[PDB]
Symmetry: C2
């Protein structure tokens, strides 16, 4: 693209919501759309991106921002980690994520009303939760009712394409789950999600479905990859966003201008950073780094909320995990790799997560004197999920997963199960994203503030206990477990579990909130139309907009945000739509 070029719409950050907004705005072939993006422009050409079983290997790769971030910062404990993985590539984090497609609980989205008014509640959002996807059920295994989860969008989704060898595993896990007295559930798309379900995925015919699928073969979209944002171009007199400044690989600064609107989609971490570098954020924090304040927006970078996860690995009987096929070199791996290469069939095309659980654990919580007291102190309402929401998402990954074992080596032998214990309704206060300096090439500082509240530790402990009961005592599955890796979970000691949770937890990869939808600038950074409070012609569409984190893996809500954003922009520009 030529320096100083004008486009109707500029999307800053070709990520998950970014491409969604861009592709929708481009549906009028006459509307000019520019996308600027730090990463490569041709993800579909990269096997590790398109191949679902390679996902975890994308951590630390060239497609990963690989941020340092503080996971917990309590007086008794603090840990900082790297990499806190985020996608750096067209498609953003939808190009390196773990595929699960799940919206969340109706009661939770209904509470968005406090921030976004009625249009940001469950029912009105349902269509936006479905618009991006085209649902498939080729093997005809699931209720035809479930076809309503795809509205016709360019992101192919399907229930996991089941691995044949894992059928015995699925059957035992199912038996175990029911033996605990917990429900099976298939429809988790209408606001209810209690039980063990067969998850859907952004995978189809063993290929990844990334947001880059929104923006190809559209000649009205100009895609400029490999450029790093320096600053939003803001006219102070007009209080207007004019466009964006970027730096090329050769180190040249380029300005691009939007004739209608700029949409900021740089994700939960970089969106608030670029706002601040552009003069929009907490005034004391700007001054501290030599940045003028154009709009004193206190909430920018604040309210960072994520799900803490404590994963744990069990060694399981031979043939009940995929380690020997996918993880280790050999003829077995060679075979499935050769099949995948010829027609994309086989387990190489698998995302390795097929059964997912959304339980409550009231009866475990009730056994803890402290939880009992906190609940009473809250007038008898459950602190975590007072509206019937799950307490956990339990992901049963059917092999050792490096992405969920940041400090333990990969075992050399044996098949494994990796259970991701994801606290989906935490009550710890949010963390924050702050500036390290005014340098656009430095990562912002990131504190997730996991487990600031002790109750969260107690719940996480109890969700590990629930998972252990299920797997060590559950019908069928109890016979599959061989050992705990890399040592025993100290479930016998509240004291030890306290240390175990803090020291072993990680991000579940769902950060949100840093430029949240709101009714005014004293509550959040963007209004219900996702316009930046205080600025004209500037909107944010990405996970930073999310005012209350969904009860599950969040990519579905992020696409929803992009779909709604595009709709709201179209409604505004009558002459174009």
């Amino acid at each position: 693209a030529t320096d100083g070029s004008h486009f109707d719409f500029v999307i800053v950050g070709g990520g998950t919501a970014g491409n969604t907004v861009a592709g929708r705005l481009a549906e009028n072939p006459n509307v000019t759309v520019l996308i600027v993006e730090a990463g490569i422009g041709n993800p579909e050409d990269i096997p590790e991106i398109t191949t679902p079983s390679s996902a975890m290997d994308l951590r630390n790769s060239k497609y990963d921002w690989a941020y340092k971030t503080t996971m917990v910062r309590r007086d008794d404990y603090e840990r900082i980690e790297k990499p806190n993985t985020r996608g750096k590539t067209l498609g953003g984090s939808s190009s390196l994520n773990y595929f699960t497609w799940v919206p969340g609980h109706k009661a939770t989205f209904d509470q968005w009303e406090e921030f976004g008014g009625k249009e940001w509640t469950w029912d009105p959002l349902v269509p936006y939760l479905r618009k991006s996807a085209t649902y498939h059920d080729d093997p005809r295994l699931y209720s035809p009712e479930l076809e309503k989860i795809g509205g016709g969008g360019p992101i192919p989704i399907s229930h996991a394409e089941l691995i044949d060898e894992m059928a015995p595993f699925r059957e035992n896990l199912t038996k175990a789950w029911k033996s605990m007295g917990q429900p099976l559930i298939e429809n988790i798309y209408d606001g209810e999600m209690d039980g063990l379900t067969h998850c859907c995925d952004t995978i189809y015919r063993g290929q990844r479905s990334g947001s880059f699928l929104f923006v190809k073969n559209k000649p009205n979209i100009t895609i400029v990859p490999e450029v790093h944002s320096k600053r939003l171009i803001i006219n102070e007199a007009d209080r207007t966003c004019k466009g964006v400044t970027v730096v090329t690989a050769a180190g040249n600064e380029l300005n691009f201008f939007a004739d209608r609107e700029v949409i900021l989609s740089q994700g939960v971490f970089e969106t608030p950073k670029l706002l601040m570098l552009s003069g929009i954020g907490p005034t004391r924090e700007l001054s501290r780094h030599g940045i003028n304040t154009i709009v004193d927006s206190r909430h920018v970078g604040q309210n960072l909320m994520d799900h803490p996860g404590v994963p744990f690995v069990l060694r399981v009987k031979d043939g009940f995990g995929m380690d020997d096929v996918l993880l280790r070199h050999g003829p077995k791996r060679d075979a499935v790799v050769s099949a995948y290469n010829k027609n994309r069939s086989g387990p190489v095309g698998s995302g390795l997560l097929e059964l997912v659980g959304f339980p409550r654990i009231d009866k475990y919580l009730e056994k803890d004197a402290e939880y009992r007291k906190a609940k009473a102190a809250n007038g008898g309402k459950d602190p975590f999920s007072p509206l019937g929401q799950p307490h956990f998402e339990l992901d049963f990954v059917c092999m050792f997963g490096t992405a969920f074992q940041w400090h333990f080596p990969t075992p050399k032998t044996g098949d494994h199960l990796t259970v991701v214990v994801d606290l989906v309704r935490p009550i710890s206060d949010p963390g924050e994203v702050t500036l390290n300096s005014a340098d656009p090439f430095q990562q912002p500082n990131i504190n997730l503030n996991f487990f600031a509240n002790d109750l969260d530790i107690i719940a996480m402990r109890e969700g590990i206990r629930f998972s252990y009961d299920l797997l060590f005592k559950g019908e069928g599955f109890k016979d599959l477990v061989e050992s705990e890796y890399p040592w025993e979970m100290p479930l016998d000691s509240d004291k030890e579990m306290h240390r175990a949770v803090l020291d072993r937890c990680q991000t579940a990869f769902h950060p949100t909130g840093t430029a949240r939808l709101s009714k005014n600038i004293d509550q959040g950074v963007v209004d219900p139309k996702l316009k930046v409070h205080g600025i004209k012609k500037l909107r944010v569409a990405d996970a930073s907009v999310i005012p209350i984190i969904p009860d599950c893996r969040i990519q579905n809500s992020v696409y929803a945000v992009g779909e709604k954003c595009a709709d709201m922009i179209k409604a505004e520009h009558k002459d174009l739509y």
Copy 2:
């Protein structure tokens, strides 16, 4: 003590060097000495303090500052830890340390000349390295020449009082060491230290020898424990230190004044902090926290240097470690505990470290292409120890040691060996101590900057390899090893070892340098008489003074610093001494 009281000398921080200086100045019964100290005043009354086998249990106890500190801060990796243990109690860190008494290499102390001139070199310092100690050899096991290591001081020291059951262990380790072609050595007190030695300790008749032994039964010493320093009292016009302000348990601020001199002994972390709070430090760093600059002293808090350590545990054959006697509850433990209680005999009185190795590893280093290139680039001189110094201190702790395994649980069964691989001559740049704020009750911020230079990683890797060779291949000992805890050291992969070293390393507990001796304020913070550049009547005596870290565990050099400081103060006040 009464508010506003005057004393000839005020020691701020009743720690290792602190008490040394105080006790020596008090040798003229007419000189009044005050000691202020944050911790308790009666350590000799605390079993866990006086009992050498309890040392490791003092981590996280009430006697531990338990600082958060950043261990490594590289672009590819960063870890922050808690607790970074320091003594909070009369005697300071000499009240919770692991006893080893070893001075270091002559060539290294000779290089102090660049900072302190001739009087801070090996020969002149020898007497100061010996003054604090009274050497014992009751069982008459060692050369009578070695009695020269005790000059008659109030700190009883002895070669480790050997545990009988560990004799077979010592004998096998010795055989293994010699089988590798490395020397045995007993005299490591005259500047030479190449080999495996029987270490001496600040233990005698199974009681800890702490610096509090310097300051009891001296009625001219006023001891005020349980008070937290707020600030040094500095007269700007006179450029003079007048005394110190402290806060009591009840929250009252008290001023105490020195008629001759104030000696700051708050240790490597708190000494630079209090200087800064008092207006002495880097001016930009003071202003940033609202503190006036009285003296722009750039080096304050800078030059923090410590030894990185990568410990590792081996499970060893039954009866070749002390786990079953000291670590686990039972009749065995009951028996030795009952003996200790009646007459202080038995392994309960042991510091658990009896053999210590000081090897070079030139031939391991030479195998690494990068080391070879770096050495050539340094004109053919070894980067680490170009003057013949050791590369490592290898501590062979004869049981599982929690103090050296910060992220692994304590094994439930088996006897263990804990090998502390201490890189004693690192070449990474120093870290820093900075202010978090002007609040005297907040810990300063601490970055140790371990492994900033890749060569250090290569050496640490190779010192682990040397240790593994010794123990897995060495004569006698090879037959004792049962397994690696908690998994295998990835010695087969330079790549994995790189991650292993960074992720498993810790402080070896020897921080230094943050107010270093120097010839002028452009080089350091105190002059050769340990006077603070720019200020009269103010000296620093503690580990922050140390300009080049010794080649080993450092408590001996710290007492040396205190002994010299006291001598230099006495020489100045003729009318009193």
